[PDB]
From a paper:
RNA polymerase II (RNAPII) transcribes DNA wrapped in the nucleosome by stepwise pausing, especially at nucleosomal superhelical locations −5 and −1 [SHL(-5) and SHL(-1), respectively]. During nucleosome transcription, RNA polymerase II (RNAPII) gradually peels the DNA from the histone surface without histone dissociation, until it reaches the center of the nucleosomal DNA (the dyad DNA). Conversely, in the histone chaperone-independent pathway, the histone transfer from in front to behind RNAPII is proposed to occur via the formation of a template DNA loop, in which the upstream DNA exiting RNAPII rebinds to the histones within the partially unwrapped nucleosome downstream of the RNAPII. In the present study, we performed cryo-electron microscopy analyses of RNAPII–nucleosome complexes paused at a major nucleosomal pausing site, SHL(-1).
We determined two novel structures in which the transcribed upstream DNA behind RNAPII binds to the DNA-peeled surface of the nucleosome. We named these structures RNAPII-nucleosomeL40 and RNAPII-nucleosomeL60, which contain DNA loops with 41 and 62 base pairs of upstream DNA, respectively. In both structures, the upstream DNA is sharply kinked at the DNA exit site of RNAPII, and is folded back toward the downstream nucleosome. The upstream DNA spacers between RNAPII and the nucleosome are 10 base pairs and 23 base pairs in the RNAPII-nucleosomeL40 and RNAPII-nucleosomeL60 structures, respectively. In the RNAPII-nucleosomeL40 structure, the nucleosomal histones are located close to RNAPII and may directly contact it. Consequently, the nucleosome orientation relative to RNAPII differs by about 50° between the RNAPII-nucleosomeL40 and RNAPII-nucleosomeL60 structures. The DNA-binding surface of the proximal H2A, H2B, and H3, which formerly contacted the DNA, becomes accessible and captures the upstream DNA. The length of the upstream DNA that directly contacts the nucleosomal histones is approximately 30 base pairs in both structures.
Residue numbers in the entry:
A (entry chain c): 12 to 117
B (entry chain g): 17 to 109
C (entry chain b): 25 to 101
D (entry chain f): 25 to 102
E (entry chain a): 39 to 133
F (entry chain e): 43 to 134
G (entry chain d): 32 to 123
H (entry chain h): 36 to 123
Amino acid sequence: AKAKTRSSRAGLQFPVGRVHRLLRKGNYSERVGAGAPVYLAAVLEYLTAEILELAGNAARDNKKTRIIPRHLQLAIRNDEELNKLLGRVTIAQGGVLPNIQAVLLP
Amino acid sequence: RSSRAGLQFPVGRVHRLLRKGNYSERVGAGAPVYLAAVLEYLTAEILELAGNAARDNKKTRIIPRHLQLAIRNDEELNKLLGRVTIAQGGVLP
Amino acid sequence: NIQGITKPAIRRLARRGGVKRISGLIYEETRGVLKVFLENVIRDAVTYTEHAKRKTVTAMDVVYALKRQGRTLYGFG
Amino acid sequence: NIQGITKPAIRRLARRGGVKRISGLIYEETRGVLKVFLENVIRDAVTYTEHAKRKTVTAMDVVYALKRQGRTLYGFGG
Amino acid sequence: HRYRPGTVALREIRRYQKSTELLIRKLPFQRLVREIAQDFKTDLRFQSAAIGALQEASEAYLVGLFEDTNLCAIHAKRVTIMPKDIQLARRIRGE
Amino acid sequence: PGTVALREIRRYQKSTELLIRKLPFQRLVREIAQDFKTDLRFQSAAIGALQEASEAYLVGLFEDTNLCAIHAKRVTIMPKDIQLARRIRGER
Amino acid sequence: SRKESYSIYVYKVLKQVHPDTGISSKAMGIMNSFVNDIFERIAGEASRLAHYNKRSTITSREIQTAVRLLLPGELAKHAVSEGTKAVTKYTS
Amino acid sequence: SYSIYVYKVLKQVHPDTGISSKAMGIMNSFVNDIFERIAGEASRLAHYNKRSTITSREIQTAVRLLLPGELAKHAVSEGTKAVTKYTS
DNA sequence: ATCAGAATCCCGGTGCCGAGGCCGCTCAATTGGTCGTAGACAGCTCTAGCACCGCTTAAACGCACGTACGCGCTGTCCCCCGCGTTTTAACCGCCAAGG
DNA sequence: CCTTGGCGGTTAAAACGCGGGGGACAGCGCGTACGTGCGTTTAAGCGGTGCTAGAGCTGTCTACGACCAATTGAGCGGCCTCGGCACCGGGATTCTGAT
């Protein structure tokens, strides 16, 4: 019949077929379910969406139309749960959150 | 096997665990020999020191406390096991 | 039930940690900390327990949770 | 070349880290720390490079070294 | 002829650093664990070894934390640990 | 004293550019690497990765160091502070 | 030879959540790094889950449990919703 | 478990010394832990280089990555020595 | 209370490498047929554990009286900060030593 | 008459040199909660007693997974367009030192 992609069937933007292949050749298990790559692709897509949402918001706050690594850093660090998820991750060219000790201030 | 490699640790078992551990599609003949040798060596070092600790405390048997003392008083063993909790090991005085 | 972790017990733990003198406010603080820790481990542990379609938390569930928090525990395998 | 990590540069790094005032002995101390850090990462990186039978340290070798040292780095996988 | 302030504390430090027994009472720990666990998943049971594992882990964690806390207090030229010290230790740990 | 320091803090916390000079960092990396294996080459991105990682590390370290200094009722970070931070981190 | 990244999918998602927003190449590199990282975390945890339970198959259930272990709170719940909905729709 | 092998080793290094059940449990935990660290690292090494086979070379490199200093040198020596003897 | 001084943020004016879009080919995803071993379902035993209890007591908080720890301020001395002078950290475009 | 050395210099950034400012170390004096010895009422250690609960094992039934041949959608080479915000110079606003 006319081909329909697994991503299209799953209602996703992220590639289910590619994710499946990566699972198969990643030596994770002897067999893989069909639903596994669908689920995984969906989760990855969702997380990507949350981060791009916050980073885009940060980009608009700086009167900017293009997201840069700084915006990703602002997005991640000002979000408690993303900050937890990426607690051991370095964002290149992200810098740091503005934060000075109030006590130190004159 | 283990007799041929001059080891006490089970080469066959290590090989099997490698095969079924979802590590690679294939496993070379020398890999489990090497790995078994390394594990035996580390075990030997720790049992050496822990045994010495047991002698100091005048107990023939080795208890977790002796293992803790042995590991923490050895710099490299201590780094190797820096994120490990030994049950009933207590701490260094 | 958090009060079941009594002052003396906390003093004993601190002594093992080499502490000579202890503020009165420490104990409640410690309890909070302990609570958080437990909540973090047990959560993950139970997750494992439910994945195995079990109702009994095993020693291994705990070990896996601790391991995944980078709090590796020897002696309960 | 560790001295190439100048006082002003270290001062800038500390500023980003929120430091207002800096003892004179800090800089040398920092040079020590950084040195150690680099030694640990680069070592592993070179190990990867040597395992691949290459003579060129790649960005990925560094990324893998950082990852195994629990220093995950984003932005250089490309 | 009562002892000097700071002698029995030290003696206790020696004593408990020289031993390995669990320092928290079993039953209250058990009750606390089961209580916390009820808030995640219901009608749970526990192997005794599971609870024991939790207690070894918890006590090891608390002891290490108290070591670091002590270091913070000593850093501030004190001999007395305060909640402030614990909070510094936990912040630097990334907790 | 302090006003320009505060100014600098605001400035560098606002920006993301690398704070160590490129060429000397490059030299340091190649020197250290030369001590493990000789005649090594480097992708430019490899060195860039090393510098981003190193500066993020030092910056975080300086945050913790700052907290250690402030804890001791000081405003000036000292080697003691760095050593405490790194000890609690499990680096030493 | 062919080279692969998550770039176009990240872009599509970006256009979903911010129709008038673009993204630098470096930021895209960071997003690709992110996706690969979380992929390895989830797949790895699911592998361990399957092994612990003497199962030779990684299913959506392993993936779900792995998501619950790795992600905090609301992020986990929302991710679970997205995953479950995607699988239920896909099967139908 | 590795109990019988740990015991054998113990008898090699301390002929008149025994070991408690708990301590044995800790040794078993140890052996499994290091097994996973080394095998995991070797797996990643194989994947990075698009190799489908884990060989003694991956094991060795993994050991050099995971073990500190003298432990690494000696472990590497023992591994190579064992492979050489096995091969003979 | 106010009054003067360098640093900060946005506006005429604009361009150059960064970002986005057609044509199409070889690589990746889909369809199709054949084993084929794995998952959901269903039944059965009894052991590790759950909930309250008898005997016993170690033990956490409060009483009596006091002292070295914590802290704000004083007296002193003790270490960073700014502009002019340049230089080797570098990087470019011409002389003179053995074949 | 053909090869490859170091001063010479566009850019910009801090060791010396003199005047200036904010903070650490020890004591005065205050304020006080637990050290050490007891006194009381409660839940845990140890061992009993009743009981309801599902994990490992085995058999049914089912079906997508993996592997081996065609078939097709597509991401970037190769170009071909389209554009975002800092450099240049200037206007308007702001903490800090000084009266």
